[PDB]
Ligand binder design. Structure first.
Ligand SMILES: Nc1ncnc2c1ncn2[C@@H]1O[C@H](COP(=O)(O)O)[C@@H](O)[C@H]1O
Ligand SMILES: *Cc1c(COP(=O)(O)OP(=O)(O)O)cnc(C)c1O
Lengths: 791, 70
C-alpha cells in the first residue's frame, strides 16, 4: 500500500464502504475518522508483521514492561508522525473534501491511564520502539478511564468515560489466544510437589495494539488483557469486573496472563515453527527481561517462581536464580507512606499458593541478612517482608527488592534517598542493586507532533537527526545571539499562542488576550502541589491592579488545570476557588484583559498537547521535599516555556542543565522545610508580618469572592491559617518576588527568547530515548539500535 | 462545691481562643520543658515498645505537630 495521496484516498474509500459498511449518504464525521484511522492502520500493520518476524529470526532478549496503566492519548496523529504520513493524509483527505484536524478531534484518548506513571510507560513504549528494542508493554484493557471531569458551576462533575463505545480502530481482539487466570482454591501438597486445586477461573482475552518507532520501521506490541467470566450471575459480575480485593485481583490478572505469554514465546523460539525446543530454562534470563513499573505487577515474582517450581519442576534455588536475574523494579514514590502492603488474610483466600511462596522467599531472604549481619535481630524485623502489628501485611516493595536484580528511582536525589533512608538496610545488604534512571519524555509526541513549528525551525538549522538524538539540540547554543533564530523562536510561540486562544474561545466563551504571557500550571489538584500558592499570587496581581488601576502590568492569562480525586474534599474546593476567582477577576471592568484566570477542564494527553506548546511559564511550585520526578516539567522546557519553581524533583536536574541563571527557582529548599518542621511552622507569623497576605485571607473569609455564600471558603482559610502541611504562606513572599522578576524579564522580548533558546538547547538530557538506552545497557543487558528496517 | 474543694487546672475557654489567635505552636512548650523532652524521646525510641520501635510515632507526630486539643 503506498504513501502516495492516490492510494491513500483509494484506501480511505475502500475502508469507509467495505470495512465500515457506510456510505457518503449516512456517514458522519466519526465514520470518516474510522476510515482514516483504518487507512493509516494498514501501514502500521505492514511494519508490525515484518518487525515481529524479525524478532523471531534474531531471537533477541525481549523486554516486558508490565504496568497497571499506560496513558496512551490518541493514536492517529502519533502514528502519522512516526510513519511520515501526516501530509499525504492531509492532501488525500482535503482532496476528498475532508479536513483532517476536524477528524483527528473525534478520537478518544485511550482510557488506560490516570497520570504520570501511565504517561511514563506510554513514553517508554515510544522510545523502546524508536531504539529498535524487542519490547512489549503488557496491561489490563480498561473499558472506562478514570472519569471525565465536567465543571458545572465551579463544581466538578465526574462524567463517565466509555472511550470504547464505538469500537477502537487501532486494536485487534485475539479470541484464539485467551488464557486462564485462577483465583481462590486450596493448596494440596502432593508427593511430587504442591498443587493449587479448587480454583475459580477467569479468562483473560488478548487485545493487540501496535506501537510505531519514529521512522525506523520498527513497530512493537502493546498487549492488554480483558477479563471474561467463562450463584453464577454474581460469580460472573465480579469476574467480568476486573475490566480493596478487586485491586489485588486486577494486579494478579495482568501478572498471570502475561507470564503465560512470556514462557510460551520463550519456548516457541524457532522462526516458522510453532512448537517448543527451549526447554532448558538456563537461558531464560538471557532471553527475558521483566520490568516491574512500581509495585503493582509485583506478584510477577512469586508467580514466575510458582510456574518454574510447581509446573516446570525446576528446583527452588535454580528457579530463584532465574527469577532475580529476570526481574527489575522501578520505584516512583518518596513517601514510605504510599507503599503497597497487602494483608496476608486477603492473600491466603485469594492466592494461598503465592503466600506460601512469599513466606518461603522471606524465610530464605531473612536467613541471608542473618549471616550478613549476625546478632542484629531488629535489622531482621526491619527487613522482613511480612510486617506484624495490628494487621499483618506483606510489604510488596521488600518483595520486589528481594526478588529483583536492580531497583531504581526516577531522579538522582530520589534514588539517593532510596539508598540513604527508605531502603537503607537493603542498600547495606546488596548495594549493587540500587541504580538511578532519571525520567524522560519522548521528543515525538512531546515536540515534533504537538509542536511542528518549533521542530521546523530547529530542523532548518540542524536537520532532523535530533528527534532521536535530542542531545544534538546543544548545537543551538551557537544561535543564542543569532537575530534570525531569536526572531523565529519568538514567532513560533506567537503562532502557537494564537492557535490556543481561538480554541479557548470556541471552547470556553471568554476572550483571552493572545499577548498576555500565558502562565500555565497543569498538575493533579492536590495540596502538596500548591495550586493555592498560585491563587494567592493571582489574587495579589488582582488587588495590586485594583489599588493602582493605571500602573503598567505585564498582561497575563493564568491557566490552571488538573483532576481532583473524587472524595477529596479540599481538592474539589480548590477547583471551586480557582473558577470563583475567575468570575470576580475576569469580569471586573478596571482589569480588562490585564489579568484573566482560567480553569482548564478535563486535562489529559490531547489537552496537554494543545496547551504546553503555547505556554510561556511553567508553574513547578510543589513544597520542596514532596516531589520525585516531574515529566511535565520537561515537556514545558522542550517547548519554549520558562519554569518558575522550587528546587525539587525534575526542577533540580533541569536548573543544572540549563544553568540556574536561566531558571526562576525560589523559596525553601529541603533544608529549610526541615528546619521549619524542627522549629514549628506557624502561619500566623506570616499572616501578621505581611499586609498584602492579610488582605487575601480577609477577602476569602468575608465572602468577596463568593458573595452569595459568604463562608464557602472557610475550609481553605482555616486549613491555611491553622493546619497547612505544605507551608504555602512560608513561600508566598519569595514566590511573588520571583514572579516580579519573571514579568520584568518578559518585558524584554529578545532577552526572554534568548533564555528560552538556552533552555531548549540544554533540554536533551530529558528525552526518554536517553532513559531507555540507560535501562537497556545498565539493567536489561541489551543494546539500543537506530538500525532502520526495510518497508 | 466551691472551687476550693475542686482541682481545676489549665486553660479556660478564653485562654485557648487567645492561644489560637497567636497560633498554637506545640514546639515552644517542648523546647522549654525538659521532662516533656525526655518523654517524647522515650516514645520515639521504642522505649515503651521495644520489639516495634516506631509503633507510637504516629501519635508522637500528632502531639508534636498537629495537636488540635493542646
Ligand atoms: N515462530 C515464528 N516465526 C515467525 N514469525 C512468528 C513466529 N511466531 C510469531 N510470529 C510473528 O509474530 C507475530 C506475533 O506473534 P506472537 O509473538 O506469537 O504473539 C505474528 O503475527 C507473526 O507475525
Ligand atoms: C506530562 C503528563 C503527566 C506527568 O506530569 P506531572 O509532572 O504533572 O506528574 P508527575 O510527573 O507525576 O509529577 C501527567 N498527565 C499528563 C496529561 C501529562 O501530559
Amino acid at each position: 500500500g503506498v504513501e502516495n495521496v492516490t492510494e491513500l484516498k483509494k484506501n480511505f474509500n475502500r475502508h469507509l464502504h467495505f470495512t465500515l459498511v457506510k456510505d457518503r449518504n449516512v456517514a458522519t464525521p466519526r465514520d470518516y475518522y474510522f476510515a482514516l484511522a483504518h487507512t493509516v492502520r494498514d501501514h502500521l500493520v505492514g511494519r508490525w508483521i515484518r518487525t515481529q518476524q524479525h524478532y523471531y529470526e534474531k531471537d533477541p532478549k525481549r523486554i516486558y514492561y508490565l504496568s497497571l496503566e499506560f496513558y496512551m492519548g490518541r493514536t492517529l496523529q502519533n502514528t502519522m508522525v512516526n510513519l511520515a504520513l501526516e501530509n499525504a493524509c492531509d492532501e488525500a483527505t482535503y482532496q476528498l473534501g475532508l479536513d483532517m484536524e476536524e477528524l483527528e478531534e473525534i478520537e478518544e484518548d485511550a482510557g488506560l491511564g490516570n497520570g504520570g506513571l501511565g504517561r511514563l510507560a506510554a513514553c517508554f513504549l515510544d522510545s523502546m520502539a524508536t531504539l529498535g528494542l524487542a519490547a512489549y508493554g503488557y496491561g489490563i484493557r480498561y473499558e472506562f478511564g478514570i472519569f471525565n471531569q465536567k465543571i458545572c458551576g465551579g463544581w466538578q462533575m465526574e462524567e463517565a468515560d466509555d472511550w470504547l463505545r464505538y469500537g477502537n480502530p487501532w486494536e485487534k481482539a485475539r479470541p484464539e489466544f485467551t488464557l486462564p487466570v485462577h483465583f481462590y482454591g486450596r493448596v494440596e501438597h502432593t508427593s511430587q510437589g504442591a498443587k493449587w486445586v479448587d480454583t475459580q477461573v477467569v479468562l483473560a482475552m488478548p487485545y493487540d495494539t501496535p506501537v510505531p518507532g519514529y521512522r525506523n520501521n520498527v513497530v512493537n506490541t502493546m498487549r492488554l488483557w480483558s477479563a471474561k467470566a467463562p450463584q453464577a450471575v454474581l460469580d460472573r459480575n465480579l469476574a467480568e469486573n476486573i475490566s480493596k480485593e478487586l485491586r489485588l485481583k486486577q494486579e494478579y490478572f495482568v501478572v498471570a496472563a502475561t507470564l503465560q505469554d512470556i514462557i510460551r514465546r520463550f519456548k516457541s523460539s524457532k522462526f516458522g515453527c510453532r512448537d517448543p525446543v527451549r526447554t532448558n530454562f538456563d537461558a531464560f534470563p538471557d532471553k527475558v527481561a521483566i520490568q516491574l513499573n512500581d509495585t503493582h505487577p509485583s506478584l510477577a515474582i512469586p508467580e514466575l517462581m510458582r510456574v518454574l517450581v510447581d509446573l516446570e519442576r525446576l528446583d527452588w534455588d535454580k528457579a530463584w536464580e532465574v527469577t532475580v536475574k529476570t526481574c527489575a523494579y522501578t520505584n516512583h514514590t518518596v513517601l514510605p507512606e504510599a507503599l503497597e502492603r497487602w494483608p496476608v488474610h486477603l492473600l491466603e483466600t485469594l492466592l494461598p499458593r503465592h503466600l506460601q511462596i512469599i513466606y518461603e522467599i522471606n524465610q530464605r531472604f531473612l536467613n541471608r541478612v542473618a549471616a550478613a549481619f549476625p546478632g542484629d535481630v531488629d535489622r531482621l524485623r526491619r527487613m522482613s517482608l511480612v510486617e506484624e502489628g495490628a494487621v499483618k501485611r506483606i510489604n510488596m516493595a521488600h518483595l520486589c527488592i528481594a526478588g529483583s536484580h536492580a531497583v531504581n528511582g526516577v531522579a538522582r536525589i530520589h534514588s539517593e534517598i532510596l539508598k540513604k533512608t527508605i531502603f537503607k538496610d537493603f542498600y547495606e545488604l546488596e548495594p549493587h542493586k540500587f541504580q538511578n534512571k532519571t525520567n524522560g519524555i519522548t521528543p515525538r509526541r512531546w515536540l515534533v507532533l504537538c509542536n511542528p513549528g518549533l521542530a521546523e525551525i530547529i530542523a532548518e538549522r540542524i536537520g532532523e537527526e535530533y528527534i532521536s538524538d535530542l542531545d544534538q539540540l546543544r548545537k543551538l547554543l551557537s544561535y543564542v545571539d543569532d537575530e534570525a533564530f531569536i526572531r523565529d523562536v519568538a514567532k513560533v510561540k506567537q503562532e502557537n499562542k494564537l492557535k490556543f486562544a481561538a480554541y479557548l474561545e470556541r471552547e470556553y466563551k471568554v476572550h483571552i488576550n493572545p499577548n498576555s504571557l500565558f502562565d500555565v500550571q497543569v498538575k493533579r489538584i492536590h495540596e502538596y502541589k500548591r495550586q493555592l500558592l498560585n491563587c494567592l499570587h493571582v489574587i495579589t496581581l488582582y488587588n495590586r491592579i485594583k489599588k493602582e488601576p493605571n500602573k503598567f502590568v505585564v498582561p497575563r492569562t493564568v491557566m490552571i488545570g488538573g483532576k481532583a480525586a473524587p472524595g477529596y474534599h479540599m481538592a474539589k474546593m480548590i477547583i471551586k476557588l480557582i473558577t470563583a476567582i475567575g468570575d470576580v477577576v475576569n469580569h471586573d471592568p478596571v482589569v480588562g484583559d490585564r489579568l484573566r484566570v482560567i480553569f482548564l477542564e478535563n486535562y489529559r494527553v490531547s489537552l496537554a498537547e494543545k496547551v504546553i506548546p503555547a505556554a510561556d511559564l511553567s508553574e513547578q511550585i510543589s513544597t520542596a521535599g514532596t516531589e520525585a520526578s516531574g515529566t511535565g516539567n520537561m515537556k514545558f522546557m522542550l517547548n519554549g516555556a520558562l519554569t518558575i519553581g522550587t528546587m525539587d524533583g525534575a526542577n533540580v536536574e533541569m536548573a543544572e542543565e540549563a544553568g540556574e541563571e536561566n531558571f526562576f527557582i525560589f523559596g525553601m529548599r529541603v533544608e529549610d522545610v526541615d528546619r521549619l518542621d524542627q522549629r514549628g511552622y506557624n502561619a500566623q507569623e506570616y499572616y501578621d508580618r505581611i499586609p498584602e497576605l492579610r488582605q487575601i485571607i480577609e477577602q476569602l473569609s468575608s465572602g468577596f469572592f463568593s458573595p452569595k455564600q459568604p463562608d464557602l471558603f472557610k475550609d481553605i482559610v482555616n486549613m491555611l491559617m491553622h493546619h497547612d502541611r505544605f507551608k504555602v504562606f512560608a513561600d508566598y513572599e519569595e514566590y511573588v518576588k520571583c514572579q516580579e522578576r519573571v514579568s520584568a524579564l518578559y518585558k524584554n522580548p529578545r532577552e526572554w527568547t534568548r533564555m528560552v533558546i538556552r533552555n531548549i538547547a540544554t533540554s536533551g538530557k530529558f528525552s526518554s530515548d536517553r532513559t531507555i538506552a540507560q535501562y537497556a545497557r545498565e539493567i536489561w543487558g541489551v543494546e539500543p539500535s537506530r538500525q532502520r528496517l526495510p518497508a
